[PDB]
Design an enzyme around this catalytic site. Structure first.
Site, PDB file in Angstrom:
ATOM      1  N   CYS A 137      -1.132   1.553   1.515  1.00 13.24           N
ATOM      2  CA  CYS A 137      -0.214   0.595   0.918  1.00 13.24           C
ATOM      3  C   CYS A 137      -0.807  -0.805   0.980  1.00 13.24           C
ATOM      4  O   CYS A 137      -1.471  -1.175   1.951  1.00 13.24           O
ATOM      5  CB  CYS A 137       1.134   0.637   1.636  1.00 13.24           C
ATOM      6  SG  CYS A 137       2.050   2.174   1.384  1.00 13.24           S
ATOM      7  N   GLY A 154      -1.333   4.497   4.980  1.00 13.43           N
ATOM      8  CA  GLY A 154      -2.104   3.314   5.293  1.00 13.43           C
ATOM      9  C   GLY A 154      -2.787   2.672   4.107  1.00 13.43           C
ATOM     10  O   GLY A 154      -3.405   1.611   4.268  1.00 13.43           O
ATOM     11  N   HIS A 161       7.361  -3.893   3.164  1.00 15.85           N
ATOM     12  CA  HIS A 161       7.738  -2.820   4.075  1.00 15.85           C
ATOM     13  C   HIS A 161       6.743  -2.646   5.221  1.00 15.85           C
ATOM     14  O   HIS A 161       6.780  -1.618   5.905  1.00 15.85           O
ATOM     15  CB  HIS A 161       7.927  -1.501   3.311  1.00 15.85           C
ATOM     16  CG  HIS A 161       6.660  -0.908   2.776  1.00 15.85           C
ATOM     17  ND1 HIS A 161       5.764  -0.220   3.565  1.00 15.85           N
ATOM     18  CD2 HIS A 161       6.156  -0.874   1.519  1.00 15.85           C
ATOM     19  CE1 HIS A 161       4.755   0.198   2.821  1.00 15.85           C
ATOM     20  NE2 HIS A 161       4.969  -0.186   1.576  1.00 15.85           N
TER      21      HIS A 161
END
Lengths: 306, 306
Positions: free
Chosen positions: B145, B143, B41
């Site tokens: 991830c 941020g 993503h």
């Protein structure tokens, strides 16, 4: 979201952990530049720890009695000296992985990350706090002496603690990197009384602010208090007296959540007087005091030292 | 002595954390050899997260749409592919700090260390556990991830988790390093129900053994129980059913403390039925379940992975 007891990345510190052998005793040393720092009771035995004359014991030792192993490298000691309770072993080569570093002496209530080591190899990393009685509640087995505590500032490592001994009551004492003990402790195997420990009140308030940021809000009361009236309750429950310096420290946290510092103190007072009533705050049933207000802002904003 | 929630040394993992930019979104990637692993993503926007067609979205992107920064180095993507929910970005040069590593898929109840990162820079490290409902209770901001969980085996790093999303209920979900999610979760911004969470019973018993090793012993009762009769009480309090495999896991801990596994279960039963009564175990008022029996033996013996 979420809030965790978080330790600093230990990469810059792992490359400085060495093994120091003198006679039969082994412990961990800190290899910065061409100097290896380690506790001075590496020159002792189990019976020497009773009444050690460190000056007479070190004089018996010469340069080639210190065995410094860095992973698989072994360093050539070309000088030794005793600075208070720490030994400075001048070595042949400088550590190529030496980070930008400072030696700092922290205050009670401040936090730092501990790299637990055994035989010069890092075992794990965890966060802890200098208790108001200058002790720390860590995890140190035999051979963990010389493990260092540190803080990271972007690229700079602030070394603040070196583990030296386990007190008879199961708690831990150590020195700064200049060899000066935190508290009234001495590197001698005897009964050493640590003073009455209190709870770091400014840390508890910062941890309550962190709980509000993360959703937990049942403790937000509809009352208030003054600074003096809160300190009267704090003394009853063995909490540090809150000063104006502490209230100003919580300013940013107060600004982000829209809750005045004195309003959060009344919530803490009712937590002290009435308890938790089976509920939890950030997944815990005790008032955590190992997060400084700078620690909370760090985890809530995402500060990256790299 | 002493017992702490301890994370693995993160040195070998810090050297593999990179920044991955695609369009406007930034997250962290894992640079092993000449491949960068990151959640898929990163090719999405905030509105794309609703109903993302990842195949059609990735086809719009070409090789030069992925900006991979490693500290101050930027890598040349010479190939990209989608393995389940992870992106494999083939880069020009191999990571010189690539450690010996494996990709492992852990089981519920196992623990691992998380290196929280933002923009490719490590922020901190903490220990956590795969909940029985395949979630984790960590600390992940925007941020973060692509942050990875790992275990260390002497010299080998076992990567087991990659953070992907925050569920609406404040809990975290992720995949293994092959892109397969833990649990029934999908990388899509929607209401995703995590199942009923239970307490890892085998972990609680290991943490009680750790308490006995460290002195805390008030919970040692004079009763016992059978495996079945304990499981009846465990189901009432949302505890995992104890099997014979779990009892054999606690064998070493049972051998060191001289307390049979079934004897410790009756102590836990009375802790569940009667509570703690204002007392603490290892400084806490809740039954900790984030220490596996291997974690306890590690901290109690001083295992050094270096």
């Amino acid at each position: 979201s979420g809030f965790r007891k978080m330790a600093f990345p230990s990469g810059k510190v792992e490359g400085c952990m060495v093994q120091v052998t003198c006679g039969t005793t082994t412990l961990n040393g800190l290899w910065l530049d061409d100097v290896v720092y380690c506790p001075r009771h590496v020159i002792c035995t189990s019976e020497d720890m009773l009444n050690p004359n460190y000056e007479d014991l070190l004089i018996r030792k010469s340069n080639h009695n210190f065995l410094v192993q860095a992973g698989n490298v072994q360093l050539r000691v070309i000088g030794h000296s005793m600075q208070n309770c720490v030994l400075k072993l001048k070595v042949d080569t400088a550590n190529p992985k030496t980070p930008k570093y400072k030696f700092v002496r922290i205050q009670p209530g401040q936090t730092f990350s501990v790299l637990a080591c055994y035989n010069g190899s890092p075992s794990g990393v965890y966060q802890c706090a200098m208790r108001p009685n200058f002790t720390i509640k860590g995890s140190f087995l035999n051979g963990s002496c010389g493990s260092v505590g540190f803080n990271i500032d972007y690229d700079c490592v602030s070394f603040c603690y070196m583990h030296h001994m386990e007190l008879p009551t199961g708690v831990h004492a150590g020195t700064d990197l200049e060899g000066n003990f935190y508290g009234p402790f001495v590197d001698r195997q005897t009964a050493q009384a640590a003073g009455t420990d209190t709870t770091i009140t400014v840390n508890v308030l910062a941890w309550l602010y962190a709980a509000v940021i993360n959703g937990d809000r049942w403790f937000l009361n509809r009352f208030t208090t003054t600074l003096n009236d809160f300190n009267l309750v704090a003394m009853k429950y063995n909490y540090e007296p809150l000063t104006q310096d502490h209230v100003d420290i919580l300013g940013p946290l107060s600004a982000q959540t829209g809750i005045a510092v004195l309003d959060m103190c009344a919530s803490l007072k009712e937590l002290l007087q009435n308890g938790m009533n089976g509920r939890t705050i950030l997944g815990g049933a005790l008032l955590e005091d190992e997060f400084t207000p700078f620690d909370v802002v760090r985890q809530c904003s995402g500060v990256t030292f790299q």
